[PDB]
Design a binder for these strands. Structure first.
Lengths: 106, 145, 170, 187, 61, 124
RNA sequence: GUACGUGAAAUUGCUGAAAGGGAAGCAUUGGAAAUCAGUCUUACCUGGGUGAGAUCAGUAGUCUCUCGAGACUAUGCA
RNA sequence: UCUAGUGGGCCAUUUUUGGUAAGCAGAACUGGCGAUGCGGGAUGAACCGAACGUGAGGUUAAGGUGCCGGAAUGUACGCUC
RNA sequence: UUGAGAAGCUCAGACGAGUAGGCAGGCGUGGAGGUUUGUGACGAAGCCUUGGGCGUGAGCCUGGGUCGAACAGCCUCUAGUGCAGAUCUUGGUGGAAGUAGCUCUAGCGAAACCACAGCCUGGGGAACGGGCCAGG
RNA sequence: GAAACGGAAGUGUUUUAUUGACUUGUCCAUGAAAUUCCAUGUGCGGAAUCGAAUCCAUUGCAUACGACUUUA
């Protein structure tokens, strides 16, 4: 089944936050394989999605997606800042996100 | 007249009421909770037992100051009492509801207590409004298709 | 009905001019390219020519079953595989009107719109298959000459464990 | 770098605090972590140092002695255990003494940021958690220190069988001419 | 069941359905997400009845 | 100039949820020691002039029109020159007979009606 | 239905759903579930055919205003 | 020209007098809090930043970047177990 | 170019804590004069509602339900004109509690009290504690 | 259809006997499209049943009551 997955695995770590104030509009995403802020420049502007399933079979489907884009790197270790169309729920801390390769400049 | 419950549609139900009854609201509330859902014939036997102290009515919400008994082990609780004023009113209302069903032509061997409610009458002591709806046990018709 | 009946907030003259799209230097005609989205995601196809913004792309229909299609240059990866000879096939017939969806005319009556007695279908005409066959004939010898390329276009690109696209080169 | 669904860590030679902080961050990152050989963890400081630290802890609570329970306590203090997120992250950690049968046949990784040989200065006294636990109440040290040889002997036999089996393909590799005919790609 | 399209009227539906082999036409009038009326027409030129509905309940209810 | 709302939540009076005797209509706190008046952290917001909305888009419904209250056919005819700016809203106490007359007139004038389906049935 | 127009809140009972572990309610952001709102292509332009009628008659009268301005009544439809 | 409100203190710093087991007390001075929310300081009425219309984006201050906790288990040179 | 409610329209720049106190503009209620050739038994007013909308806000408009005879917008006049507190007044109703009482019972049946929840160790300087911070 | 091994929490490691297939090992011929530029048995409520347990004949062994222990 290794003829698929055009995307890259990622994890939703947290929102942008200070010690005591959280900003849910921007989320901190750890793209796996990206290990520094210079490698995070490749994934800037790429589409990222959160894919989950819900009980109702609305649209005749069991899966729904929240889309987003990668805006800028966060820190030195390769984490990025992502803004989603809808703010990611706080329950999705440590959940998985998919980073496509489009819009591609390669 | 209108009751608290959407049932009591004439075809398969029978109603009975008692308003401004000279009995305590809290004791009547506990008796209503116990006999709710029971079969009509089973409820009559249980109410007779409470009169004869064979079975105990488990005081459940207003259980403050109520002594526990072994006869409450059936209901999964401990506190219990043997009210006779509340039981007498409920027995009379059940007799009325049974008589109403007999007039309606209902099937008498399938009657269960679908809805029994106790409400606070105006403070005259605390009187009580009691309304009972007994309806036929609805069976499922086999599809056979 | 013609004299304006309202304030008529006419837009100010906007100084925006349409200028040709500057595509990447790696998206030359004939380069093998990986499709990123759509129903043909993961396929490898040959870039015939560049439209104004999109790339008129197709895989040899006898190879991967990707017909003459348009692809946005952002949803494509320009690989460094050896280029295919595409100067032979004329691409002047591939314009935006060639790929444009048919405009809605809908000649019906209010007797068959009810009951859904229309069944309007616009299956691909024969000339489109003829054009695809002509392109395939002019492209297959080019991909046959260079080795390990015919089935390379038949395969579908995918990412495996440990693949880092920011480090991998295409 | 990359994550797996379950990560098994061989805690032999790993510092308690360094490994716990890495594990706690991985637990909050959304990963299931299994730490085996929790009795082989190391703590910087002499035997008497952490002895008085644990003896003072005994003076204070449910005093746990098992090495995994020591490690589980260290990881828990590095988690937001007062919230649902911290509790959920805790339940993804499985710390055990030794390597149980479900895990001795699975690959075990190590954390270089927590290894004693790469973090402690040579010639510094250290206290093993298993040895430290043995005198403070833990009574299963001898039986687990005896069973490890049985696991090691079985595992060593497996490696020899795997190595002997691998020799056939390794010889067959250079035997096939196509291995070197197109080895210009670096493979 | 045929979804009502455009601006075809009941008499036009009736005269069109009379040529399709249908014999009775039922039109459910609804307004603000509630069916409240039903006009049944006997085809091709039979009597037309108009009822106003109430207490609409489905099987799940 | 699409419609932008600086805020969609209402301003509820402090402690209005705690007490049923206290209504939720906004009241400016007067207590000096009250943390809401001092505008501490985590406390509820207060009506400020900065929350005010754009003058051009003020009073505009989400469809870009302004609700104009209508009580008879004379009021509908007033919006002949302003059907792109205003929507007719029939008053609540206008009977179902007048509502019908208003709705037919507004239809010829090309005037949107906010509550054109009230108190009436349809029969095609 | 005389415990009688309307019938609020506090409060009480039953039923249904959901949440439960101790500062709590509350604020911010989204998820899920339930529910709701409005926004529709339909018209416009153009051509011909067929008939129609007036604010058109190389047209005849009446009325009310100030020659011509409105309202009509016959007759023809280029 | 007239015309509302106030006619205190606290934190104390600094200069400073007497001191007295030693602390401490006494003057002036200096500003702040007092009418002031916000970032930090584990938490904090007076410490470090900064003073406020509703928002988007960017960048910082004081503090920080093992985990809790956003951010290098960074680089280089030393002390200590 | 129509953009003269000249009390309108328009252009530009700067600024925005706030007690006492000062000064403007508004929202709402009862009644009065005028007005809308106003609304109303084809349903006024009130009330209910996880319906919709408008205003920074006071508030206002509206759908549905209930209901059954009156009522409102605008200009002006007028005042017994807006409540969470007063150990407020009157009325209604709670927890205590089916407790005190007159083992389990049978009947009858209170009152005081009530801002609100309620596991501990330390610190939060003005008690900080129960309510914050760090832990168990 | 299987036999062995695996005890620490073996729950899996092989050995296969075959029975069928894909066989990317490699070379060819067809089909892919107007998706004509991204959007992606299981649970509940009832019954007829089979056991078991409690109450129960019980008992003081337990005992404000609960609840407990023996025996019909």
């Amino acid at each position: 089944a290794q003829g698929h997955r055009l995307y890259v695995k990622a994890k939703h770590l947290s929102f942008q936050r200070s010690k005591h104030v959280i900003h849910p509009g921007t989320s901190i995403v750890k793209i796996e394989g990206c290990d520094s802020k210079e490698e995070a420049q490749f994934y800037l502007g790429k589409r990222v999605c959160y894919v989950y399933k819900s009980s109702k079979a609305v649209r005749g489907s069991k899966i729904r997606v929240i889309w987003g884009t990668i805006a800028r790197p966060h820190g030195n270790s390769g984490a990025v800042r992502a803004r989603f169309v809808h703010n990611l729920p706080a329950k999705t801390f440590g959940s998985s996100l998919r980073v496509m390769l489009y819009p591609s400049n390669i | 007249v209108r009751y608290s419950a959407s049932p009591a549609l004439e075809t398969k139900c029978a109603k009975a009421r008692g308003a401004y009854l000279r009995t305590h609201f809290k004791n009547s509330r506990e008796v209503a909770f116990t006999i709710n859902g029971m079969s009509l014939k089973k409820a009559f036997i249980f109410l007779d037992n409470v009169k004869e102290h064979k079975q105990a009515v488990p005081f459940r919400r207003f259980n403050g100051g109520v002594g526990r008994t072994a006869q409450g082990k059936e209901f999964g609780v401990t506190q219990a009492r043997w009210p006779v004023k509340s039981v007498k009113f409920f027995y009379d209302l059940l007799k009325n509801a049974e008589a109403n069903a007999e007039a309606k032509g209902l099937d008498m061997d399938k009657l269960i207590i679908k809805h029994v409610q106790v409400n606070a009458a105006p403070k005259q002591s605390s009187p009580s409004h009691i309304e009972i709806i007994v309806a036929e046990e609805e069976e499922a018709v086999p599809k056979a298709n | 009905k013609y004299y304006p009946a309202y304030r008529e907030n006419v837009p100010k003259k906007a100084r925006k001019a349409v200028r040709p799209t500057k595509l990447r230097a790696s998206l030359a005609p004939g380069t093998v390219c990986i499709l990123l989205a759509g129903r043909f995601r993961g396929k490898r196809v040959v870039v015939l020519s560049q439209l104004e913004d999109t790339l008129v792309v197709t895989g040899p229909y006898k190879v991967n079953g990707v017909p003459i299609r348009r692809v946005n240059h952002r949803y494509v990866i320009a690989t460094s595989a050896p280029k295919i000879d595409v100067s032979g096939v004329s691409v002047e017939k591939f314009t935006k009107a060639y790929f444009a969806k048919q405009k809605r005319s809908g000649p019906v009556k209010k007797d068959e719109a009810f009951f859904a007695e229309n069944a309007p279908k616009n299956a691909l005409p024969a000339e489109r298959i003829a054009d695809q066959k002509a392109v395939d004939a002019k492209l297959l010898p080019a991909i046959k000459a260079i080795p390990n390329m015919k089935e390379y276009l038949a395969a579908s690109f995918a990412l495996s464990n440990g693949d880092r696209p920011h480090l991998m080169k295409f | 770098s990359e994550f797996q669904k379950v990560v098994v860590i061989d805690a032999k030679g790993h510092l308690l605090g360094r490994l716990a902080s890495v594990v706690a961050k991985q637990l909050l990152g959304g990963q299931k972590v299994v730490v085996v050989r929790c009795e082989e963890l190391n703590i910087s400081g002499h035997f008497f140092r952490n002895k008085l630290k644990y003896l003072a802890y005994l003076r204070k609570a449910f005093h746990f002695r098992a090495p995994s329970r020591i490690f589980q306590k260290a990881v828990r203090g590095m988690l937001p255990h007062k919230t649902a997120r911290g509790q959920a992250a805790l339940e993804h950690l499985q710390a055990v003494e030794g390597i149980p049968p479900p895990f001795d046949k699975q690959k075990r990784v190590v954390v270089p940021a927590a290894l004693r040989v790469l973090r402690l200065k040579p010639g510094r006294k250290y206290c093993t958690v298993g040895r430290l636990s043995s005198e403070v109440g833990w009574k299963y040290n001898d039986i687990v220190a005896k069973l490890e040889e049985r696991r090691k002997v079985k595992s060593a036999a497996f490696y020899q069988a795997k190595l002997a089996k691998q020799k056939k393909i390794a010889s067959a590799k250079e035997a096939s001419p196509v291995n070197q005919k197109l080895s210009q790609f670096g493979y | 069941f045929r979804k009502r399209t455009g601006d075809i009227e009941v008499h036009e539906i009736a005269e069109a359905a009379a040529k399709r082999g249908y014999t009775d036409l039922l039109v459910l009038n609804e307004d603000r997400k509630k069916t409240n009326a039903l006009t049944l027409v006997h085809l091709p030129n039979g009597p037309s009845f108009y009822f106003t509905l109430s207490n609409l309940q489905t099987a799940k209810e | 100039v699409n419609i932008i709302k600086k805020r969609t939540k209402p301003f509820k009076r402090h402690q209005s949820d705690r007490f049923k005797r206290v209504g939720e209509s906004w009241r400016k706190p007067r207590g000096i020691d009250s943390c809401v008046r001092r505008r501490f952290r985590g406390t509820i917001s207060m009506p400020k002039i900065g929350y005010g909305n754009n003058k051009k888009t003020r009073y505009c419904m989400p469809n870009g029109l302004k609700a104009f209250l209508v009580r008879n056919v004379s009021d509908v005819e007033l919006l002949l020159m302003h059907n792109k700016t205003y929507a007719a809203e029939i008053a609540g106490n206008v009977s179902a007979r007048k509502r019908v007359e208003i709705v037919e007139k507004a239809r010829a004038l090309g005037v949107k009606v906010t509550n054109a389906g009230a108190k009436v049935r349809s029969q095609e």
